[PDB]
Amino acid sequence: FLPILASLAAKFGPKLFALVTKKA
Predict the structure, then answer these.
(1) What DSSP character marks residue 4?
(2) Residue 9 vs residues 1, 24: alpha-carbon distances, Å
(3) H/E element holding 7?
(4) Maximal CA-CA distance, the chain
């Protein structure tokens, strides 16, 4: 889903992957 942008949100946001994608 998406090009790299979704994974960039994940990587540059450890805040974002923990919050948005709930991986924390």
Answers:
(1) T
(2) 12, 14
(3) helix 5-12
(4) 23
Helix, strand, coil percentages, rounded to 5, for the chain:
60, 0, 40
Q: How many CB atoms lie within 10 A of CB 16?
A: 15
Q: What is the separation of C-alpha 15 from the centre of its chain, rounded to a whole number of angstroms? A: 8
Burial (Cβ within 10 Å: 0-12, 13-18, ≥19) of residue 9: middle
| Count of CB atoms situated within 10 Å of the CB of 7 | 13
Closest-CA residue to 21 (of 4, 11, 3): 11
Method of elucidation:
NMR
